[PDB]
Homo-oligomer: A and B are copies of this chain.
Amino acid sequence: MTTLNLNTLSERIKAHKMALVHIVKPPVCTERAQHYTEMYQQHMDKPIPVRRALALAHHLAQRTIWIKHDELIVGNQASEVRAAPIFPEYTVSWIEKEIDDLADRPGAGFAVSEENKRVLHEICPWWRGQTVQDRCYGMFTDEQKSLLETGIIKAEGNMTSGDAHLAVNFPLVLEKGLDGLRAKVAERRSRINLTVLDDLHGDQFLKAIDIVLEAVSLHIERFAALAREMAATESRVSRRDELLAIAENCDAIAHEPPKTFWQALQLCYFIQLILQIESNGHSVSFARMDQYLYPYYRRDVELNQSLDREHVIELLHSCWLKLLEVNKIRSGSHSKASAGSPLYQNVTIGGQKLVNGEPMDAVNPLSYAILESCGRLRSTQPNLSVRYHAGMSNDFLDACVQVIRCGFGMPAFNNDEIVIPEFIKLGVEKEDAYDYAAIGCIETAVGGKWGYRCTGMSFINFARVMLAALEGGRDATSGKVFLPQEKALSAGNFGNFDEVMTAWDTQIRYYTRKSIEIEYVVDTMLEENVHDILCSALVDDCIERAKSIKQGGAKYDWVSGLQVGIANLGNSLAAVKKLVFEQGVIGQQQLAAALADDFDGLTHEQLRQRLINGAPKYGNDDDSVDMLLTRAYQTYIDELKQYHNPRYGRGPIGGNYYAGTSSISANVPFGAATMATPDGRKAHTPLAEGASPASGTDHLGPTAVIGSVGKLPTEAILGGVLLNQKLNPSTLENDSDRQKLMVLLRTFFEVHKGWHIQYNIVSRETLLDAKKHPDQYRDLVVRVAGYSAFFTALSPDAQDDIIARTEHTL
């Protein structure tokens, strides 16, 4: 049975990793901001796509590049290590407001030089009115502005950043190389007829693509020249040869399709890198790297032995650390939903493949080498996701638990047993459905053939809507009544609990329509102003259609928003149903006063405990509450069926919505703006994250949790059902308990058709000593919600929310 070595790192990688983790307050880079402003100003006469393509080519040619830390995979995102570039086309509002207050922000600090401070005040004024965000607010209705003002609906990630949230078609890049893609664009332009309106627009986008494809080849050649320059001055023979090998690799993949594993991996990273230079969208993913890079691995390692397996791990480590170098700056408020400065760069391994139309297990030696390399490095990037299926061997599943015991949150699991059948049901072609991948956190899509944001659209706070449904449509936090209704607890005029559910149904249908109206504005402002030239080029079928992903270029296009406060909604309605209506133990007006009073006073404080412990809670396998949550959630799911997403009918298959709960760390900020709820939660405290049970309310062990989670309408929540789980390391020291988990996994995915599970393995004492002496735990990694983060890079608000999570035993 494969036993992985999960401790050894080369001295090169150790020093490289150590250099990155000790950058506690990374700098900010303005190079991209300058060069984009320069080209936007010089090319106002060009169409926006061409203008943006010329902006990227100017930046790539003029920006600072370097090769550092004796790296074997080259390509820097910004002028300084771990620097965040600035992207002014999306917004400058928070930049101008916060530019002097970026050092001391809890959990999101950045160092800004005075010259960068000087440059930003010269650039940002020109972008006012032209940014994506300013244009969104030039079109929002006042009602929509007010909704976004209260925070009951939020879409800040969409208005201040590029979409990304996808994987490009790496097989296409590897098969054709950069010259082959330029040839593809030329053959497509030869079929342009300039007296046909669509072709006139199409040709300008194809021109943009060619400008960017040429620039990327020139940029790879620029690094090749840099490697040769450094090789001539590098005295160490070992490093000199590597630099020359790097220069030769770059020369090859600048034009021709890769021939070796090292070349193919470097090319794939170049794409991953430049995607995050042209756009600051996060969750840029590699999709099934263990599949499309395996032919090179097999040849170089197994057949010809030009490389040793250990060399491949070193190369993977090199790539992983470059992924950790990628950084992104967010506003002070939006950073609280993104605790740990994450970029969610996902890598998918495992799963199945089709051979002559028939499915087989896809796990291969490269799958093992990738899993092992992540176990040795124990970093936040990549966000490793494993595709489970019934045919996966115990050996590989055992190797996965071995890495879970390394205590950095990975690998996480997706489930072919639900993803493949439902994707096919939706209209994903069979060959594509079997080749799906994980994107960002838990969301899934067909890599290289899918539009942006399989999840990651607008956020609805279910708890605040529920409070409004319980109180005449009034939002407790803001006081505004967006949808008036007559029934309210303070009035005591609910005659049934059925009437409470009609109130919820009618309120959530209103906020659902508003959320979609808001997304239509934001998506269209992204469509018209911030085309992704390189990203669109590498997603089927934008080249042939001659338009961007956001215009309908992708073969598939389904998206989902995020519903926040899942456990709180169910627990709250169940407490109401049981204690107020079924038992007559709590009065409607009595409850409203405790909620408005935030359970203040001894009298109200024991009423609160009756709500906490006197009514069943989500996560204990009790149907009286679990099925109620599903019933309330189902109304949102059904309402989504009345709408299409903006790309509907414009090329892509689907063009519709579904649900999702991969709400990252939005539970803490959303809860901070949520008043007391009837589930016993006090005002301003975090909500349950993702779809996990509320912390400290699941008392019947892990098996009871998956019984509850499995009862959600998982098939309609293809944005993902996020299930966290925290264990003490001692709960997996014995093979007895490791096997106990592996059977728990197979049962969750095969019996209950679960979507995903991720594991924290860490003692409560360790996380408290990480608060005490940070310099001690600089490399301590922790699973937040869909991704991993360094515990000492978290703010205390998120540190404690993780510490408060339920610790389970097997």
Q: Which residues of B contact A517 (CB under 8 A)?
A: 194-195
Residues 504-543 of A, flagged 1 when their CB comes within 8 A of B and 0 if not, give 0000000001001100110010000000000000000000
| A129-B44 contact in complex given A200-B520, A200-B521, C-beta closer than 8 Å | yes
Q: Which chain B residue has the least Cβ–Cβ distance from A201?
A: B524
Q: Which chain B residue has the least Cβ–Cβ distance from A527?
A: B197
A45, CB-defined interface residue at 8 Å: yes
On whether the beta carbons of B137 and A45 are closer than 8 Å, the reply is yes
Determine how many copies of this chain the complex contains: 2
Q: Which residues of B contact A135 (CB under 8 A)?
A: 45-47
A646, CB-defined interface residue at 8 Å: yes
* Interface residue from B129, B195, B524 paired with A520 (Cβ < 8 Å): B195
| A47-B138 contact in complex given A194-B517, A195-B517, C-beta closer than 8 Å | yes
> Which positions 195-254 of chain A face chain B at CB distance < 8 Å?
195, 197, 200-201, 204
A134, CB-defined interface residue at 8 Å: yes
- A259 to B517 Cα, complex, angstroms: 44
Q: Which residues of B contact A46 (CB under 8 A)?
A: 135, 138-139
Q: Which residues of B contact A204 (CB under 8 A)?
A: 139
**Distance of A553 from chain B, by nearest CB (Å):** 15
- A195 to B457 Cα, complex, angstroms: 15
| A524-B197 contact in complex given A44-B129, A45-B129, A47-B139, C-beta closer than 8 Å | yes
**Distance of A741 from chain B, by nearest CB (Å):** 44
Q: How large is the interface on A (under 10, 10 to 19, 20 to 34, 35 or more residues)?
A: 20 to 34
A130, CB-defined interface residue at 8 Å: yes
A94, CB-defined interface residue at 8 Å: no
Q: Which residues of B contact A644 (CB under 8 A)?
A: 195
Q: Which chain B residue has the least Cβ–Cβ distance from A42?
A: B129
- A135 to B20 Cα, complex, angstroms: 46
Q: Which residues of B contact A197 (CB under 8 A)?
A: 520, 524, 646, 648
Residues 35-52 of A, flagged 1 when their CB comes within 8 A of B and 0 if not, give 000000001111100100
Q: Which chain B residue has the least Cβ–Cβ distance from A207?
A: B139
Q: Which residues of B contact A200 (CB under 8 A)?
A: 139, 520-521, 524
Q: Which chain B residue has the least Cβ–Cβ distance from A513?
A: B195
On whether the beta carbons of A195 and B516 are closer than 8 Å, the reply is yes
> Which positions 345-369 of chain A face chain B at CB distance < 8 Å?
none
Q: Which residues of B contact A50 (CB under 8 A)?
A: 138
Q: Which residues of B contact A45 (CB under 8 A)?
A: 129-130, 134-135, 137-138
* Interface residue from B43, B130, B201 paired with A44 (Cβ < 8 Å): B130
Q: Which chain B residue has the least Cβ–Cβ distance from A129?
A: B44
Residues 174-202 of A, flagged 1 when their CB comes within 8 A of B and 0 if not, give 00000000000000000000110100110
- A137 to B47 Cα, complex, angstroms: 11
- A46 to B134 Cα, complex, angstroms: 9
> Which positions 413-432 of chain A face chain B at CB distance < 8 Å?
none
Q: Which residues of B contact A194 (CB under 8 A)?
A: 141, 517, 520
- A141 to B520 Cα, complex, angstroms: 35
- Residue among A138, A197, A200, A643 with max Cβ neighbours from chain B (10 Å): A197
- A195 to B521 Cα, complex, angstroms: 9
- A47 to B135 Cα, complex, angstroms: 8
> Which positions 638-691 of chain A face chain B at CB distance < 8 Å?
643-644, 646, 648
> Which positions 475-513 of chain A face chain B at CB distance < 8 Å?
513
Q: Which residues of B contact A130 (CB under 8 A)?
A: 44-45
**Distance of A193 from chain B, by nearest CB (Å):** 9
Q: Which residues of B contact A128 (CB under 8 A)?
A: 44
**Distance of A751 from chain B, by nearest CB (Å):** 38
Q: Which chain B residue has the least Cβ–Cβ distance from A203?
A: B139
Q: Which residues of B contact A648 (CB under 8 A)?
A: 197
Q: Which chain B residue has the least Cβ–Cβ distance from A197?
A: B646
> Which positions 111-168 of chain A face chain B at CB distance < 8 Å?
128-130, 134-135, 137-139, 141
Q: Which chain B residue has the least Cβ–Cβ distance from A44?
A: B129
**Distance of A177 from chain B, by nearest CB (Å):** 28
**Distance of A43 from chain B, by nearest CB (Å):** 8
> Which positions 306-330 of chain A face chain B at CB distance < 8 Å?
none
Q: Which residues of B contact A513 (CB under 8 A)?
A: 195
| Shortest 5 CB-CB contacts between residues of A and residues of B | A44-B129, A45-B138, A194-B517, A45-B134, A46-B138
With A45-B130, A50-B138, A195-B516 known, 16 other A-B pairs at CB within 8 A are A44-B130, A44-B134, A45-B129, A45-B134, A45-B138, A46-B135, A46-B138, A46-B139, A139-B204, A195-B513, A195-B520, A195-B644, A197-B520, A197-B524, A197-B646, A200-B520
List residues of A whose CB falls within 8 A of some B CB.
43-47, 50, 128-130, 134-135, 137-139, 141, 194-195, 197, 200-201, 204, 513, 516-517, 520-521, 524, 643-644, 646, 648
Interchain residue pairs with CB less than 8 A apart (25): A44-B128, A44-B129, A44-B130, A44-B134, A45-B130, A45-B134, A45-B138, A46-B135, A46-B138, A46-B139, A47-B135, A47-B139, A50-B138, A139-B200, A139-B204, A194-B517, A195-B513, A195-B516, A195-B643, A195-B644, A197-B520, A197-B524, A200-B520, A200-B521, A200-B524
